[PDB]
Each structure stands twice: as C-alpha cells, then as structure tokens.
Amino acid sequence: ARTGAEYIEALKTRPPNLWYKGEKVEDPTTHPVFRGIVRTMAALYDLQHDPRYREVLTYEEEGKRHGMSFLIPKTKEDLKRRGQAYKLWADQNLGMMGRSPDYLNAVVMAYAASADYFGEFAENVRNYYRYLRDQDLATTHALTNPQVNRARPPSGQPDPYIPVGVVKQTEKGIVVRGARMTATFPLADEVLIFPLLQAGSEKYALAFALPTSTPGLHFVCREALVGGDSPFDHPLSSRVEEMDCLVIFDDVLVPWERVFILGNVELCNNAYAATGALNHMAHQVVALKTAKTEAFLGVAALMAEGIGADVYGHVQEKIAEIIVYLEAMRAFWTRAEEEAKENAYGLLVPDRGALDGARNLYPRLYPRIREILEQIGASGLITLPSEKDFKGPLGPFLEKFLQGAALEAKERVALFRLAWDMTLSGFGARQELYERFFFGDPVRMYQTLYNVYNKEPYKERIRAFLKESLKVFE
Amino acid sequence: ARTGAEYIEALKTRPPNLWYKGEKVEDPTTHPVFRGIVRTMAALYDLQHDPRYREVLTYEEEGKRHGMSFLIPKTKEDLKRRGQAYKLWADQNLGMMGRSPDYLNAVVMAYAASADYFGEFAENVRNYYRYLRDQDLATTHALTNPQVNRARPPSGQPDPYIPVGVVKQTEKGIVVRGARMTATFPLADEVLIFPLLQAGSEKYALAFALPTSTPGLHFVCREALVGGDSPFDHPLSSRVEEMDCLVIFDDVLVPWERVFILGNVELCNNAYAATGALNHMAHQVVALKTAKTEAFLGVAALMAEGIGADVYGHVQEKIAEIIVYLEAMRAFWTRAEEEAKENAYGLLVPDRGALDGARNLYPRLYPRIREILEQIGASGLITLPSEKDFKGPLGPFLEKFLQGAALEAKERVALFRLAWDMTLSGFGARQELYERFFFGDPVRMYQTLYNVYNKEPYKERIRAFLKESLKVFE
Amino acid sequence: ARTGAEYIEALKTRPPNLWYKGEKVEDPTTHPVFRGIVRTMAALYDLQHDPRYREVLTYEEEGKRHGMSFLIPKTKEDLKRRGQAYKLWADQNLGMMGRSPDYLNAVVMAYAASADYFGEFAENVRNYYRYLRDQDLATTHALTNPQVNRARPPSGQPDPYIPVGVVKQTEKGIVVRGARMTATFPLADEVLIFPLLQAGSEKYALAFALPTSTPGLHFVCREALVGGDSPFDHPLSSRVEEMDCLVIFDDVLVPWERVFILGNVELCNNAYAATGALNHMAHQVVALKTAKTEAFLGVAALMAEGIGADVYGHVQEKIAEIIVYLEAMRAFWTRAEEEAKENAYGLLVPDRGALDGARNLYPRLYPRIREILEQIGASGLITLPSEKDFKGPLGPFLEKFLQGAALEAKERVALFRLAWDMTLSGFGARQELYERFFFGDPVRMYQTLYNVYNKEPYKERIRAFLKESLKVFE
Amino acid sequence: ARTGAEYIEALKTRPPNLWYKGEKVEDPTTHPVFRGIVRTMAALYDLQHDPRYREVLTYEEEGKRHGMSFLIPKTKEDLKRRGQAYKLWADQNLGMMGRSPDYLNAVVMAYAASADYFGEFAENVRNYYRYLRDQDLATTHALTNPQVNRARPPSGQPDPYIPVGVVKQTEKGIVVRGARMTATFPLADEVLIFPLLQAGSEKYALAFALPTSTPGLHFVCREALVGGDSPFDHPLSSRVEEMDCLVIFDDVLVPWERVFILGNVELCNNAYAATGALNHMAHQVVALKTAKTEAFLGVAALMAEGIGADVYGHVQEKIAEIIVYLEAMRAFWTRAEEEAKENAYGLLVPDRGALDGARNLYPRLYPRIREILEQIGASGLITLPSEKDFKGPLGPFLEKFLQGAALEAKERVALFRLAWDMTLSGFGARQELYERFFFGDPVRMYQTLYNVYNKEPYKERIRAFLKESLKVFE
C-alpha cells in the first residue's frame, strides 16, 4: 500500500504526458491546475496508513499490505469490506471525486479473477493486476471514441484512425494510432484503454494498459475548473478538480505483455459483464453516490436551518425528497451485496439487477437533488463575498447583513460557498453533466437493460392470468 | 386458518352493514357488485390449504394452523417468511388488491407484540389479536375524518360529531358518533377504527374494533367499478373491485373489551410507530407493490412484442424504466428485512428507513408506470371489442384486423383489455388515485419524514468539512 | 343549418352501420349506449337557431344560413368568427367532446378552398364541401391503419388488405378492402377516410368519403363508457360518450364522385399541410382545449374552496399552474389568428408555428392538469354516494358528513362526481389517453416539427456570434 | 440618447461604489472583472446611433432623441415598437444579459405615466423619469431584504436595521440604514431601491433612487464568473458577466426629491401592479426570453448537426421541444400586446394574463432547455481544449480528432465552448439560478397568481353545468 508521499514522488519523477493550454505540464504536483487534486489523492493513500482506518482500507497477505480495492472477494463479508472501503474514501471528498483509482482497481481485480476470459492474454491480465496491486498504482481510463460523426460507426469516420486502431503488429507488440474522447483524473501512473463495437470493427477491438508517460501518448486538458486555492472561497474546486482530457495516440507502441484483447469485437463487447468488472465497478459507484447524496442532504439541511427556511413545509418536503433518494441508493447497495452470486469464472459478484437499478436511476435523481439545493438557497447561492471581503473594511457590515438564523456570517457564507461549489460553480455544474453520462448514455444504457433483463417470468404470469380470459371461447 | 367456504358462510350469515345506492345489501356473496371480490378473498383463504403453498401461507403452533400474517417474527428468517406470504397472496391478483387482510393483520400483530404500549388496554389488544388469528377473520379499516373543512381541526367542523367522537361512557363501554371518510374492502367480519390529531382532540383520540354487523354501524358504498362478469371483457374489475365506503356511526356502542385507546391524543399519534405496526404494514406494502410492478412489466412487454413496437428504442427504454422501478422496490424490500432490529418492546421490525423510502417513492413511480403503458399501447388501449363481437358475425374480420405480430386476435384483445383494465377503466384509474394516497397525503408524509429522520450525521460531516474554510480567518 | 330534430331523424332513418357487442345497432337515437351523445350533438345543432347565438354559430349567404365551421375565411376577422363558434360549441360540453363535426368541417372547408391541390378530383372536393355545408351533415373520420405489426409498413402486414387498399377500379368507382383502426363519434351521416405513407404504398394512398350506411361498411364499437343516465351520478358520461370504433371495409364500393385522392403517396402525405386543413383543424383544437382547461380550472377552484383546502399554499399553487396553462393556450390561439397569412392557394390560414406549439404542448399539459385535480380532491374523488343514497334512509346522515366548508352535501357530491367523471371514471380516464394521442403520436409529431421548422435563422445568429471566436486565429 | 463613449466616461468619472475581494474598484471600465460587461453595455448604447437601428432603438421628440424604452406608449403600435427595441438589444447578447437598463426604464416609464399613484411624491417621479430619459442613464435595482431569518418578518430580524429602514427624517431628506440582498449589473449611474411587506413594516416601506457613487452606499461583489478574455475560450463570460452584489446603506442620506414612497406599506405592495410597471417590465422579459430561447435553439441545432447526432429521433424530438417552448413565448408576447388595455391612470399596459403566464412558465421551461443542451452535447461539452492548444504543437492532432460531421475542428470547439458557457461554466450555471428566481420565488409568485386571478367565470360555468345534477332531487 502506497503512502501519499510515494504517489507524489512518482508523479514528480515520471509525470503523465499532460498538456494545458498548449504547453506540457512538467510537474503536476506543483502546477496550479493540478496540485490540489494531487494532494487530495495523496491524502487518500495516506489514509490507508492511519491506525483508525488501516483495517478498513487495506488487508494483509503473506507479509504484504494491499489496498482493499484489490481484494478478490470470496464471501459476502468480503464484498461488504470492499464496500466499506469505497465509502470511507468517498466520504473524504463528499462523493465529489468520481474517478478515484478504486473504481478501476475493481475492474482490474475482476478481470484478473476471471482471467480465463481473455484466452492467451490471461496471464498478461493476472500479471497486470499483481503489478497494480503490489505497487498500489493510480489509474485513469478512456473508453469512448472521438465524437466526430455519430451517424457512422468507428470505421466510417473522416479518417480510419480517428478512433484508436492497430496500425501494425511487430515482435515487440502493437502500434496504435487514434484518440479516446475522455479520460478523467489523468494524475495517474497508468492509463487503461479498455472496451459496444459493431461487427467489422476488429482493428478497434482492443484492450490494453500503458504508463502515462509513454512516448507518443498525450493528454490534452480541457478548461480548468479550479476556482482558486482558498478553501473558504472554493471549498471543493480548490481540491477535487480531477480534470478531463482528450487522449492522443501518436503511433504508440504497446508491448505484448500489456495487451489484454486484440481484434476481437465480441470479446470486447462482453468484457465487463462476463468478467464481473461491471458488477464490481458499479458497486464502487453505488457506495460513492450514497456518500454524495449524504453530502447534499447535509448541506440542504444546514442551508434551510441556516436561513430559517426550514419552517416552510415545501422546504421540509424537498429535504425529505433527498432522504428518499438516499434510502433508495442505500437499498440498492444492500441488495447488491446480499444477493451476490458467483459468475461463470467463480468470482463472487454483487447483484447486477440492483446495480443496474442504481446506475440507471441515479442519473435521473442527481439533477433533481441539485435542483433542490438551488430552490432552497435561492439568492443566497450567488451572494458570495470572499474571505477577503470579511477581512477587509466592510467586514463588520457583512457580519451583520449575512448572518443567518442563529448562524454567524462567516459560517453562513462558508456554507453557501460550499453549496454553490457543489452546484453552480463551473466545478459544480460539471458534476451534473458527469452524473448524467459517466457510466454511459442513458438512452443506450436503458436499451441495454431492456435487452439483457429476463422479462419472461412476468410475461408468463400475465399469460397465465389471461387463460381465464380466453376460456370464454371454449 | 380459514377456508374460502367458511369466509363465504360467515359473510352470508352475518353480512357487513353495507348500503348500495340507497338499499341495504342483504347478501354480498351473491350481489352483483360484491360477489366478485368475495370470491377473490375466498380464493386467497383457500390457497392456505393448497399443499403447494401451505408451508408458505401458514404456520403450525400447538396443534393449530395460523395464517402467516399473524406470526410474531423473532428472527430475520421469520420476517422473510412473512414477506413471502405477502408476495404470494399479492401475485394472485397482480398486486391489484390493495387491502387484503394481511395488511391489517400485520398491524394487529405488532399492536399485540407491543401491547404494553396501550397500558390498561393491553390485554384487550392481546385478546383481540388472538381472536383475529384463531378465527382467521377478515378486517377493514377507516382512519380519516370526513373531508368537510380541511382548514379547521376535528373539533372545528360544522358539528362536533362529524368526526367519530365519544358521546358518553357507560358500564358496558363507550358510545361513539360520527363518521370515517373511507374504508376499503368492507367485505370483512371486523372493522378497525384506529388512529395526526392536534392537542384538544381528546374526544376523537380513539382506537377500537367492531364486528361489521354492529347495530348503528353503516358502510355507504361509492359508485361501483365492476365492469361486468366476463373475464375477457373485464379481467380485473370483474374480480378485484374491493369497493370504498363512508363509515357511519349512529350512536354505536363499543364494548370495553374492544377499546384499545381512549381519549389520549399522543398515544394515538405514536401508535403505529411505537408498536412497529408502521414497519410491518409497510413491509406488506413493499411486497405488494413489487408484485404490482411485476405485473405492469409483464403487460408492457407483452403489449410491445404483441404489436411489434418493441423494435423501437424509446419503447425499449420505457420498459427498462419499469425494470428500474421494479429493482428499486425489490431493493427497499431486501434492505427492510436485512436491517431489521427490535423496537422498545422487543418486537423485531423491518427497517423504517428503507420502508419510508419505498412508501414515499412508489406514489411518484406508479403514475409514471401507468403512463408508460398508455404510451406503449396508444389506440390499442381503446380498440376493445367484446368477446361477444368475436362470437358474432364480424368475428372473422376481427381475427384478421386485430391480430398482432405473431399473436392471435383473441389473445391480443384479451391482453389489451387487461392493460386497459389496469389503467383506463374506472377500476384502473381508481388504482392510480389509490397509489397516490392510500398511505397518506404525500405533502404531509414528506413533512413527517423530514421531522423524524435523523439528519445530524450528515450535517456534522458538512460542519467538519467546513472547518478548513473557517480556518482562513485564524 | 340543421336543427337537432333533423339530425335525430336522419340517424333514425339512415343509421350508421354500428355494431355493439356482436349485434347491429338498429336505432342509435334510442339505444342506451348512444342516445346520450346523440342528444348532445342534437343540442349543438339546435344552438345554431337560438337567437342568442345564431350570429355566432351561422352566417347568411344568398338566402341560406350555414354553420360557421363551413365559412371560407377571407380576413382575420373571419378567422376570429370561426374561432368564436368553435369555442361556443366547446363550452357546451366543458371541452369534453373532442370530435364534434366542426373539426372535420374545418378540414373539408380547407380542402375545398385549396381544391386545385387534388388535380382531376378538385371538383369532387368542392362538390363534397357544398354537400356537407348545404345539408349541414355530421362527419366522423378514421386515418390510421390497424395496429398489427408496427415494425413493418402497410404493405408488410400479415395480409395485403389489413390496411384499407384498392382491390380494383371499375366504371362506377373503386372497390376498397381493409380497416381503419379508430373512428371517434360514429353517430354521423358521413365518414371521411382521409390520409405518413412510405414509398410503395400506392394502393393505400387514398382519400374518400362515404355515407355511414354504405353496404360493406361496419363500425365495431369498443366497450361503452356510459356510466348511467343520472346527470348527478354521471354528469359527463351520461351525455358526452362519443364512442370509438374499428372501421371495417368489406369490399366497399366508393363512387368516383367521392374519390379525392387515388394512388398518390406524396399527395396524401402533404394533403393537410398544403391545403391548410392542418391549420384550420388545429385552430378548432386550440379553442377546444382552452375551453377544456377553463372547465378544469373551474372544478379545481370549486373543489378547493368546497373542502377548505384553498387555504393551503400548495393547493393555491396547483390551481395557479392550471391558470398558467390556460393562458398559454389562449396565447397560442391569439397568435395563430393574428399571424395568419394566405397559403399557396390563397386560403387564409392561422399560423402553423403557434398551432404546432399548442398541439404539441397540450398533450404534455393535460396529464398534469388531470393530476392536479387528483391531488386536490384526494379521497373526496372516490367518496361518491349516489343520488339514490341521498334519497334513501341514510340521506340525513350524508347531508351531515359530506357537506363542505359552506357547501351543502348534495352540491358537494355533485361537484366531486363531476371531478371524478372528468378524471377517474372510465370516461374520464379515456380523455387522458385521447389528449395524449388524438392528433398523433408525440414521438413522431415532434420529429415532424423538427423537420419542417425553419431553424436557419437561429443557426445563422449563432454562426455570426462565433465569428469573434474564430478571429483569434487570424 | 447616450453613446457608448459617454457611458464609459461617466463610469470612469463617477464610478459606482463597487468592492471586489476587500478592495474598492477605482475604475470598472478597465478592471479585469468589469471591463467586459462595461464594453457590452457601451455597445448597446452605440447601437442607438447605428443608421440601421436608430429608428428601432430611439424616437424623436421636440429636437431630442430618446431611447425607445422611455417611450410612453399610446397605441398598440407603440407597444410593438417598445417590444422590437427590447428584442433587438436582447439579441446582441443572445438573451444572456438579464438586467440591461431598458427593463428598469420600463418600470420608471410606467411609474411616471401613473405618477398620480405616488401622491405628494408624484412630481419627484415625473422629474426622475425625465432625468433618466434625457441623460439616458443606466440603472440597477435591489428589491429584496437580506436572507437572514426567513421565518420572521423584516421587523423581526436579529437587528431592526438589517433590512433598509428609515433612521430619521430631516429638512434635507431621509437617512436610511440597512442592506438589500441583490443588485445585478451595478455598472450603472443610478440605483433604484424600490418595493410584499406585512403590516407593521412602515419604516421599511420605501421607494427611492440614488447615484451609485453616493457616500455611505456600497456594492459588495460576489465571486466573479469571468472565465477570461478570449472570445474563443469564453464567448459569453468574457463579455456578459453582469455581476451580482449585496447593497449596503451606511446611514445614507436620500434627498427629498429622490423619495417616491415613504412609510406606506400598501402603496409599496401595489406599486408595480397599479402603475403598470409590472406589465411593462414583464413585456421586456418576454421579448428577452424569446431571444434567449432562440439562441439555445440555434446552438442545439448546430451541435446536433455538428456531431451527426441529428439523425437520431430522440435528438430531433429534444430540439423540437425547444421549438415548442420558443413558440409558447412568442405567443405570450403577441397576446400581451394584442390584448393591451389602459389602466386606471390611462396608461396602455400589455395584458397581465399573458405576461403572468410567460413569467411563471419560463422558470419551469429554462431548466429543461438547459438540460436538453446537456443531453445533446454529452462529453463534447467538457472536451474543451483552448485556442492556445490549437495554436500549440498538438494543433494538427486536434484538427483531426475534434472535427465534426462536415465541420472543422476549430469551429466545432468554438461552438461547444459556447454551449458550455451557456450551461456549465460558472457563468452558464448562474443563468439557470437567475431564470428560476429573478422575478421572484415561484412558490410565492404562484400563490400571488392564484389570489389575483379572476376565477369566477370558470366557477360559474361549472355551477351552471351542475344545475342538471341537482335537479334530480326536485
């Protein structure tokens, strides 16, 4: 298990090939756009060594201590342990960090446990898992093709190599060219280029991993959403801005030992479901969204009490709505673990029904949770003087005009600055788009659910009920 | 455990004091408006003796066999057993029967287990429970005051005795006068007049039970929603029309042994929560709504496949939405049982958090589930020829024009007649209003949730997070 | 202009070929399922002769008096006149009659004014218009193909003649075979079989009209939704149940003079838009929905005041929501008339933009308006004793328990019976499905709007705004 | 009529008493946070002198040229003229500038036309109007009390002078102390402290205006939302960030000639409605939101076409939804002008029904319009490289990977940067909160609509319809 210092030293020594506004980022640990999130990830690693949480965040195995997200669960109790670690890490950042490495460790863990799925590349997968686990490395991933012409398949874009495709194969490995649309949290040691491809997309049907410093690999950052470094003025964006980037592959060499899937469309399409990676990554997600909803509930309640709006029925109802959604997520989480069963490879996986429910329902609930905070806070959400204003000549006036019902002005503004950062700052607004799409496009996710769900039991019950209807003709 | 024949004989012998369109109902077992639901309840009782379900629906105790809904659960396994019985009974009627007696048996069971709550009336409660259990009687209940002037409390209506109040107390019991707004499924042996009263409502703070044939007690039926007796034309209304009625008390004598609460506002207000009746009745409800949602999923899928509409993405998405809601209810159900703990009286009760989530979320989901069926079926939902049309001269034409994609015309119309009866018939539409309000007014239910929920843990996490914000002033 | 007596005599003399539950309807003017709506239509005709409304409902032309819906408007004032007639007729039935003949007269009027559109059949159209106008006949229409396999086109169904198609052409006319899915209000003298067909549907690309008594023509009625004849118990279903039916064509001969379009797919697809029939029929619709919304507003307000629920903020807000929707419809109506312009044939047509807005927005608003009534009335909506109960032994008790805040019990129940009939009776629920689909499937209506709307002006404004963005590279 | 140069010189000479992060803003015309919006307002003034728009934006009167927003309309044509000016100004900034001065000029114009309303202060109002008109000054306003304890009235806050109240009256005027919660666009010459106060709020029942440089008057700015100065990277926030601020009154002297209402609660509460200011300001708003919706439609269409997503039905439907909302706003606008009538003071005012519909409906529509853009753009909305990236080493790669369907990469990113700035940047997200609340709290706005609307006509129609119901008892 890594310490924060080791993570920081690793990024400083071998920084990811990041670019910000036309320039290479030489040291993300000190760069104003990335130092906040780097310190945040470092704090997550350090927590693994805190005596209070060591037993929750790590496990011992033959003299070594590994991060809990690498644990191959054998019992439901083990699943619960993984869940508690997901939750503890999530709570540290109020569920605002959506791509902490444990999400992808869940994927790689499942891939390894179900390694036989990958055929000749099975050993590569098992070895990669051990590598990530032993070194406790941080990962980032990019799974979607460039948004160019969505009316055409990957092979029908303006150029054959817009999506990442194999240029050629050599004795050393494969050379790839193209790009992946989005990679969140590129402050990692490794990048996973993992897998719905249509038939005839063989050259794009790939799955591999690479060090983020690999020659020819570039991460182009979008506009930064860090509001500043003041924790008062920017409570969340100053520390949890994970960054999103376009990933470019300029004839990058992928060593054979890093290849997990090559030229197999079906193998790519069913990788997450067959291995159980889908189940485990969604397990981290349900714990994460439960933590996120808890944070929103806390802020909504404090805001309402803070300005005396809690006496109004509709405000109480809005907060109760968040409570209902919180309980729904807790329920999915519980059922996912309690109904867990082993898959074809013997890997215990949390229930897909419950997790499909959670990941397809939360994208609908989050925009409403965000709306509720807006409706409760109203103008208080944009009446945001800075800590500098409180420290300035008008400070005394602000302490009078911005106090709340039994709440001091500085505390009140600190709270609304947080509520604003969770909803209306560039950082906060991005979180909304993130919740709507991180797991996929709802339109296709729902179509996928329809097709995979076993609807026969219900159709049969109705056919049986209709027997009496048709008997009138006998 | 009662058989259907015993239930039918009991209603025939001592019929409830029902009135329909100005006339007394002498025999509900043969009356056209009530015979269907009577046969349906009778079938539920008969199922208790079916070898296939006897172990699910009943339990043995010292030579006797009792209905599972009377079982005082001591373990989570016992809770699961109660849940399986709720579900099996619910499935028989596609979750359309909302007031089957097991809902109220759950209430009385909890009242009895937590009998100490009732003080001097504790023995009356325990004895009443044993009575209902041993005789396996059917119950109905009425808990709301007449909807007259909602701007005023029970004591501020046009007359002091519009709500049910105590006129006087005698050596035999109490004399009550007034009315209860609604009692669903009055085809029962007993009626429960159970309990938010404001201070000063002592004369209305009552809780008692009476035989439905008690002199002075009247049940005034609303417009009947039985479409007819043909199972083809009216698959649900011909058998599951439970009926709703206004309950009148014309100076009715309630024997002291039937009094459970007398003149105690606080005791009335906290009765369901303190005894655990709330938890157990909501447990029956979550199982019931899971069954109901399963029925809607089955019909939606069959309709879409039936007319070839399943090939359209948005139709698949609508069905997937029902699947998401189904999984949400299953999740609440699972967590309610898995997180069960004993209350102050030592009674194991399913988790209130999960159940409050389920009963406050389903009223929002049901209208949408109903809407989805409407959007999928479109004009097919009102193109409803009768079985008589298929049996008539134009039958051959109908078999051609109303066939579906690989579905025979009679089967197609049988299906759409069912979908219509579940949504658009008077019977179906009532179900919507029922789901919106049976457990209470959402406005007040949400206000109640806000006030009872422990929000402190979340507020504290935020206050802790804000410590760094306020430190900038140090 | 016809009188009600003339309409009744016409239906009695030459009744439409209606079938109800396997039997031919010999006299719809006296049949229990149809006599109510027949009397209602008769009353609409009689209103044309009422001195108070004669100038609003009819116009004089060379010694004759014609119904206003036949007026070919030459000025915006004429459009306003047509609108006032639509509204006056609509108000008579609280906007619950959705297929009164003036809707189709608007279509035929436009077809006639734009007769050149039909080529060689132009004279047939002009003559048919004059026929309907002079005789002031009632019409019904059926435009959709049987809902059998929606995954395939009209030519890909289980049989080539499921949809209405031409079997052969003779010296007398064309012989057609097939069926139309739905025809509402078949208590008419004439049926219009008017027109999105895909290429290759020539044999189905038809447009013609026939007397409803034509040999081989059959109207198969769906389950009746008439609750009874009591105006107290069934205020709307006893008089406004228009009925829906499947229309069968058993090798029906259509005389050449009744053919308007034959074997021309494009001509069929653009018929409503090119002639202006779309604009005028939608004009009747916006006036109709304005009347309907006014009725819902009135009932919602009376219900709230009636039970003292009007003192609650959220109830006031719900009623205000209906007011907002009412104003939106009034606005569309006003703009449709004020922005009217002549089409290619010189026919003044109300603005399509405003009408497309109204007909695509109301299907979304109506379900909410209906929901609002449910949320306001709650249990009062199913506490529906009959007039027979008030006339019976328990009458005195009901007058006490069902009175409202300053409202007598009989008046209160009369009101809630109406609210129930507008929302929850089989009649009321059907109205919801009707609003969702009568003008077409929202999915395709929205796709149609997207494709026909001129989006260029807005795209150009954005491109212009972006000029400054691209200049940074100069 | 002012030129942009005159406006800039005025702010430079007598800058508003603005504060940003604890420091006084000496010159907002050059300050990085304010120079953009100052240039934007200056451009609006300059447009008044453009030969192409002079006749639309100004009117001639006795040798002088005044801004159209000052025109006291005498005919509907004059109303149309005011509307066209509102629209032309709005289009310049895609409807993103919500507090351009013409909104408040509409208020002052109405106040002046209805000056008699103000009694002894009538002349002050007329003179103030002439002052603003002749000098063509820019105004800002603040109408709400500090959000401290919303459970209590203005007189029940922690201090009597949290809200703005009169400390004392002198021969020169009144001395006021307190604060107003929000003032948008403080880059103005004048601030309007205009008016629902409860009885007993006399000391707070004020209405006056002051130069923004008045001693003791302070504007405390919230966190700035200017993303930068690049029009490519920040197309809107670089120029339309109006800024919001808390307004402090430190014993400010208000000259008697600037007092419009003093110590009169009722006069304050009915000021906007009685004078017609409500009608005219809402008229500017409906034109503004029509312009805003047009911009969103243009961007949505370009985005969909740009990435080839326009071929998908649901995307077309989402764009059509925006079209429906656009037409709804156009309709309200048209009806507001066409149904205009004179008020009690003889001032022609646009219809309140239509405007109440527009201002109470748009706050519900905007969040959905914003959501639609998010659903269409998906990950493209956060894949935002900078113009600096295109100008850097990876430029060639970006031109390949971020091109669209028949759209160059730079154009594509320019477009998505705009879409992002309209929805997800701090600037864009604020616009959402702004639309939800700028005209007031929806909860209270709806309650206000319920209370002021004449519901009698609809209630009467229902009572009349129910006559037949009650006749069954005769």
Ligand SMILES: Cc1cc2nc3c(=O)[nH]c(=O)nc-3n(C[C@H](O)[C@H](O)[C@H](O)COP(=O)(O)OP(=O)(O)OC[C@H]3O[C@@H](n4cnc5c(N)ncnc54)[C@H](O)[C@@H]3O)c2cc1C
């Ligand atoms: C903040 C944020 C963070 C993210 N982080 C990551 C990450 O860390 N790793 C990663 O791999 N991905 C990440 N993503 C990407 C996310 O997984 C995708 O946004 C998502 O899967 C949907 O595809 P898309 O964005 O390419 O949109 P598109 O597919 O381009 O769709 C645009 C629109 O077109 C529609 N459309 C397009 N194609 C079809 C179709 N075939 N059928 C129906 N409709 C169609 C979509 O419905 C929609 O309305 C992130 C996204 C966001 C917004």
Ligand SMILES: Cc1cc2nc3c(=O)[nH]c(=O)nc-3n(C[C@H](O)[C@H](O)[C@H](O)COP(=O)(O)OP(=O)(O)OC[C@H]3O[C@@H](n4cnc5c(N)ncnc54)[C@H](O)[C@@H]3O)c2cc1C
């Ligand atoms: C089909 C159906 C079956 C039912 N079956 C049963 C049954 O078997 N047994 C039983 O006991 N009950 C039954 N009920 C009753 C149900 O429990 C009640 O409808 C519900 O609790 C709400 O109260 P109410 O109907 O009296 O409506 P009301 O309280 O009259 O409310 C009408 C409207 O007024 C509002 N309003 C009124 N008071 C307030 C307030 N204080 N604060 C805020 N808003 C207010 C409500 O929000 C709403 O918009 C049934 C109801 C239906 C519809």
